Write a protein that binds this ligand. Structure first.
Ligand SMILES: Nc1nc2c(ncn2[C@H]2C[C@H](O)[C@@H](COP(=O)(O)OP(=O)(O)OP(=O)(O)O)O2)c(=O)[nH]1
Ligand SMILES: Nc1ncnc2c1ncn2[C@H]1C[C@H](O)[C@@H](COP(=O)(O)OP(=O)(O)OP(=O)(O)O)O1
Ligand SMILES: Nc1ncnc2c1ncn2[C@H]1C[C@H](O)[C@@H](COP(=O)(O)OP(=O)(O)OP(=O)(O)O)O1
Ligand SMILES: [Mg+2]
Ligand SMILES: [Mg+2]
Ligand SMILES: [Mg+2]
Ligand SMILES: [Mg+2]
Ligand SMILES: [Zn+2]
Ligand SMILES: [Zn+2]
Ligand SMILES: [Zn+2]
Ligand SMILES: [Zn+2]
Lengths: 481, 493, 481, 493
């Protein structure tokens, strides 16, 4: 068996070692052809037809690119072909755990269907990777190509999900710490996963990418920090790294958190909840699973992809009628109506245990207006969006090591004020979107009054269309004028 | 709300869609009403390039976004012609009609696009005459009737009986068997040259797919449609007003068809993409008796019969692949097994490619007889295995410039700088001596369904022997794959 | 005479009305083929070979694009073909006044050579446009195509430089105020000049553009503000407009203010100063002009382009030897050495009348270090760079009018806090770069100590390489650790 | 500073350059030393496409950035081959030598590139044999000697006497008149196939200019060089180790030469770009006696003689155009007048294009006689004016696949999947019946130096009459420009 070359529109011709080919050509990996990267986003951005499969090839490719580059520049690091393969495998497999419509599944559906489970796609990736290895006899193939399955499988899993349990990793020692900063960088978020998705999502969405990952690679080195050898960037690249996070935030603003993309994800999630009792997916030993329980059995989960949307849409089962009706409303573009967007003022954070109480609050607001209809808590959706630099309140650049021209082997730190005074004052905020499920002219006008009144009551920011939509409400607030 | 000339104005709010190919596309509300139906949205679930995605991972794109693009460009070209030549009397009505035809021209595609009408339906139901274009007409009629579009059409100045007919003609051509069109008369003949140009193949369908397939495949587009639009005019030709291109664009038009042929060679006819389409087709044939799709009046249809009922066909998309793959029914085991072999990349093995020599053409009626011929070859090679007709697949590919043996540029009208309203013709020899001497050829690919090392070695011998026997061209790897056969054919050396 | 089509790599096929063609095909316009858009930038970014000529075609094109779009959407505005042509002409001609190496000439050279003159390229554009009109008989051609030369020439000039002297414009009334917001927008800086240069500079530099001007055009309308009809953007486009200015700032950071690009511009300026007495350029009536005085005579200025660099480089005149030597040092890449970069702390601004005193201050600093050499004020260059959002301290988005979906004809305002809390706290800052003209190992080490000591003394920010370059200096400052 | 294996390591700091075509290019310090000289930096002041910039405003790019690109790709390809095949014993020394040849291959270009050696020098000094490639060898020798490069070469493991010779051979070919190279022996023959491939024209020079010219011109590149690199290997062929391409890449290689021909048709041979080059050449001829360029020992040279002294040639760039345009000397008035006419766009008028018929070829020795022939035509048309030989320009353009009448793919070696070390040949008929039947042709363009309406009308008649007389092909606008002539030629209808 020989290597294969794959032509990718983002990266061009990607070479795949035959061990990678064996892993790719399995039902557990090919499954990713059937899960859209951006989920409901495709229903707003028609170019965003791309699936997790090709993203995963790109992450595999870039992981190998970066590790090879570091090795070529610093032979003293003793990066081996074995190391390169392990990093490539982690890149290829980091997203094996995604479910139907990607973020929607672990971000919206599972928390609603089964509030007690701890589920993240990353956890799913580890479990699916284990299932892929065992179901396809990969361990002997790994051995043939110089890998040590016991150590290296563990290493791959650590690269994907982080520590499985002082140096907290077992797959590789401290003098190879930099290898853990490639696929999923828990220290500062600078990883090849982002580099592929910035480039790939932009290609498909029709928005242009301003981050240059190849430049980052050219300027990346390995430096000693504490007892570890870590990735270090050239000092004057700091501005580019701030802009990388800006880019990430803009893509969330323009595309990933698009108000309509999010409402479509919400409606699909609703249909899945209404279908969940009635859809059967066969797992190991012929056991039957639900959409929400397939995550417990990797054989069942293998067969759980975006196909579930069409299974529901095409169904005739009267038990599936409620679910089916919601999907039919998407097709006719009878979506829940966007009422508006607001933000908390001051240093107030909205806590996750409070999200479910918010539609109640909006319905319980008292707009001093001639209201032709009354709306209830169930008529409202309140979507709270956490926008940050990937580390809650923290500045990720405070967790980057740099090197200088005249001492390329010496790590230094660079603070925010050493860079620019035009950078963000803080690194996390919340956006609150409100929609109304009742879509007639009179319910919508009413929904607007409740919403803006609620913003007033909570001392939230004034909606941008506030004076046009709720003119009898905005004057009452003098903080807004 | 607002008034103009003393009358309330019904302002048409346009939706804007951001497309990676065309950028921001504005959609008139009538187009939006057509788009937001189950019959149109269906196209989100049918890959443009079908099995091609399994070879080119960027080619995830579906017929939906291609269709928006074709609608957009159709409008672009008609608008450009009308702004340059007000005397054509192109109306907003005409523009909407051409946009609608562009939007809807591919409504009739089935699962995996080309695979469905090109491979599956001809094998499943050999006596039906089905094309995706026919399917588009039927699906469009169904879309209109199921969603109450006719009043909306009238609201925006269309005359539905005339205009629906015109739209259908744009998609499929004349609706019968003099001027053959009823939707529009001869002084608007050019309107039929926009979405699907039957005269010479220069249409906006090609323009979108060149750009979009290239974007996704990771191959670069070398044709510039915007330039063509800039240089397009309308000229009187044989009692019609037809599209006419600037004379000096002739080289670019030859290159347009060269691009199309390159895209077929590199991507659409990729040997492995084709074998994947072939395997999916085989699975569908195996599943065909056992899949039920509910149509109108609750009637049940098969994959192959859903084309007879648009309510059922509405629900027939690439999803059928996963329905088969995920199935548990023992009746579906054979179909399911084939799709599983695709996932493991246990594909039929490519043996090679050859072509006929002289002016010999392989007849369509003889395709079925070819695997028998390969299996009946007698290679003077000692082999471990014997292969039968059923072990061979023979795929005959017709590569041309869209009009069989004919040069499409012979059917293009041109104008010259100093007389922009006068149509002329330009012959091949007036352009370049480096252009093709003929405009159609056949490629013959051979595969083996037995995939082990011994069987493939044997298939290579049967194949090259057959090529020698039939005086086909020497396979490119002939010296290496069949050293006991190739040196013995005197016309190969 | 017919229109012409030009193929441009940024905009594709641009149609040029025959009146535009007549203006383009003159020595005053074709001159722009010989002036690099980015000046010394080409010596750092080898793709940046592009000239002001093709940029000017693109600005002409986009100006026509925007005016046509507004007219098509709002016929009630009565935008005529005459208006479109006048706006296109202003777009084509807005940069006629640029001199050798663009920004370098009016930004660095003229202020040094002739400190008493008021010179800006925009002023030069008006003067060159007048010279183009008069020298090429354009007024009858304007008349032939429906223009009113007296009114329309004035209008074009106003679009380029602003008011030539309540409604302050004479070329067009208040109900066509939006026409003054196309080529050079003095109100908020949102204009087609930026749109071309973002796209074009990015194409050549090898950095990707993230601003979508075509999207802006799709969402642009004309709304009533006070007594004027002004350009108004859709409310939810506000984030994109903040990002437009971010983009502008990033391009300045990465490319236009590149530390080496700036030092090359500085050296070229020095050579021009040393050549200025000795270069003769023939103007009207055969009068002779200098590099610095050609700006006084448009006939002379017509012949003043990047060619002056090579005239100096290729010269044999012993009077030009000093100038020639500086250019020869550029060729051999013997450039002044970058010592570092710093910023003022607090709300301190460095005033323009203080720039010339700064090399003195650096030389007068007292580093408590074993210094192997002493450097003087003339050994130092101190480049102060003003980075802002185009309106000094002000937020340009406070000067943008918006419209909402449910009232497309009603202008509103949107404040910073209504948008995002991750946006800049302020909109202007200063960067201070220091270089040393003495390029040996010992002078450079010394230069570093003077520089960092000076930063300490002034309470400027700590240089990013501060601890590596000046380790015996950084500890003294506790504000830095 | 730092140590490794008990020895201080002289770390080679690489400069990085951001190029819009190739992205971030790393330059070894030896390459940097060569780049940072007046002889190299000179290339910043010579436009790649010369007069083409006056038709395509994006084509502002210069030979400098193209040269960096060629250096980069040369290194890329040699590195790729060496990593795939360690048995070739490609050393860092070899890699640097190929990079240096790539960097320096165009050092000999003059003002406006092709215009200078293609048009100007042949007219100014008909007996000299000058090519830009010869100029590159001379300029490289001058660069090395004037900047003390030989010690730097030794510092990085080069053997200057061997390696300078090798570099020169890469640029210009054999340095004399068996194995014809001294720089490297037969087991490194493939190294001569990288920068300037004399065997078949597949080299990295083309790869850079395809990508870069397209980027600037606003036409899209359809050739994928990175793919070619992925599929390139080294194979034994006739006692040499040569580059060999994967068999299935043959279609892409035919398309590479098709792309080159398209770029010549669309851009490099644009009728107006060519007439602008012609006018600039005319100005240079008029100025040639009066421009002085100081060379070595203070000797004075002309534009046409600067090629004889590299110190003077160093100072001869596109700047000569502006020196003429800005001049005040009355001796330069005629030259200056021509450049002024370019600025006002008072260009010579294009009359038309034709080609020979049959296998008739126009001989180079007969080009000079052609304007006389056009002026000696006798159109049966009543005209206001009479035109003489001096009023006509006849530009004969040779369009081929780089090897005159020969198919370059006949000189490419291929390998097959199942035997990657074995070289094979692939013939045209093994590929496609739609490929060119011949590989060279001539285009004949005619212009008139008299630009008024009456003179152009007349020129059109003389031209078409001449085409008829010589049995050349019918001009594409013949029906429109010469209705009194065209219908009377029976082989044109
Ligand atoms: N390039 C780009 N495209 C965007 C951006 N935001 C949305 N899009 C895309 C998604 C859609 O395909 C198209 C229209 O989206 P919009 O957000 O403008 O429309 P939407 O219907 O959500 O808003 P509306 O009903 O007008 O309030 O543009 C953006 O910031 N940049
Ligand atoms: N001409 C082409 N240009 C660009 N990409 C191509 C071209 N032909 C094929 N591809 C793509 C499809 C695949 O993603 C990748 C590899 O395809 P290809 O080289 O045809 O492999 P193959 O596996 O079909 O042939 P083989 O097994 O004989 O090497 O390149
Ligand atoms: N095939 C092509 N593809 C893309 N751009 C082209 C092509 N040919 C020419 N161009 C460019 C060069 C110019 O910028 C622009 C116009 O060129 P062209 O159409 O050839 O005008 P022209 O003025 O030479 O011919 P004419 O006067 O006969 O109309 O398009
Ligand atoms: Mg293969
Ligand atoms: Mg909307
Ligand atoms: Mg022309
Ligand atoms: Mg440097
Ligand atoms: Zn990922
Ligand atoms: Zn189509
Ligand atoms: Zn400008
Ligand atoms: Zn070259």
């Amino acid at each position: 068996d020989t290597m294969k070359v794959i032509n990718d529109p983002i990266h061009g011709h990607i070479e795949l070692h035959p061990l990678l080919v064996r892993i790719i050509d399995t039902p557990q990996f090919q499954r990713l052809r059937y899960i859209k990267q951006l989920g409901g986003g495709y229903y707003v951005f028609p170019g965003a037809s791309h699936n997790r499969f090709e993203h995963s090839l790109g992450v595999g490719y870039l992981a190998g690119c970066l590790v090879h580059a570091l090795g070529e520049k610093q032979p003293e690091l003793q990066i081996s072909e074995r190391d390169v393969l392990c990093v490539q495998i982690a890149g290829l497999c980091h997203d094996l755990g995604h479910g139907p419509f990607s973020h929607m599944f672990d971000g919206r559906f599972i928390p609603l269907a089964r509030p007690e489970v701890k589920w993240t796609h990353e956890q799913g990736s580890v479990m699916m990777f284990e299932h892929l290895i065992n179901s396809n006899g990969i361990k002997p193939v790994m051995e043939q190509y110089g890998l040590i399955p016991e150590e290296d499988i563990y290493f791959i899993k650590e690269q994907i999900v982080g520590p499985l349990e002082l140096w907290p990793y077992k797959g590789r020692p401290e003098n190879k710490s930099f290898l853990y900063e490639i696929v999923s960088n828990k220290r500062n978020g600078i990883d090849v996963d982002k580099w592929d998705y910035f480039a790939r999502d932009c290609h498909h969405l029709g928005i242009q990418n301003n981050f240059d990952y190849k430049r980052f690679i050219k300027f990346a080195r390995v430096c000693e920090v504490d007892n570890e050898l870590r990735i270090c960037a050239r000092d004057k690249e700091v501005g580019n790294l701030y802009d990388m996070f800006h880019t990430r935030n803009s893509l969330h603003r323009r595309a990933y958190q698009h108000k309509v993309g999010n409402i479509i994800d919400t409606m699909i999630t609703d249909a899945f909840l209404k279908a969940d009792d009635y859809i059967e997916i066969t797992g190991a030993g012929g056991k039957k699973y639900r959409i929400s329980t397939a995550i417990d059995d990797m054989e069942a989960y293998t067969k759980l992809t975006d196909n579930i949307f069409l299974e529901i849409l095409y169904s005739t089962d009267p038990k599936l009628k409620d679910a089916r009706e919601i999907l039919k409303q998407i097709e006719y573009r009878n979506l829940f109506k966007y009422v508006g967007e607001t933000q908390p003022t001051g240093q107030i954070k909205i806590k996750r245990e409070d999200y479910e109480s918010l539609p109640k609050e909006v319905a319980s607001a008292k707009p001093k207006v001639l209201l032709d209809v009354k709306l209830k808590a169930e008529d409202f959706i309140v979507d709270v969006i956490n926008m940050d630099y990937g580390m809650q309140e923290k500045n990720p650049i405070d967790h980057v090591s740099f090197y200088c021209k005249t001492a390329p082997n010496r790590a230094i730190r660079i603070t925010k004020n050493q860079v620019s005074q035009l950078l963000p004052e803080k690194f996390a905020e919340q956006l609150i979107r409100v929609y109304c499920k009742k879509v007639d002219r009179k319910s919508l006008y009413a929904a607007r009054q409740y919403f803006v009144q609620w913003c007033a009551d909570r001392n939230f920011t004034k909606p941008q269309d506030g004076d046009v939509i709720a003119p009898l409400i905005t004057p009452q607030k003098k903080e807004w004028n």
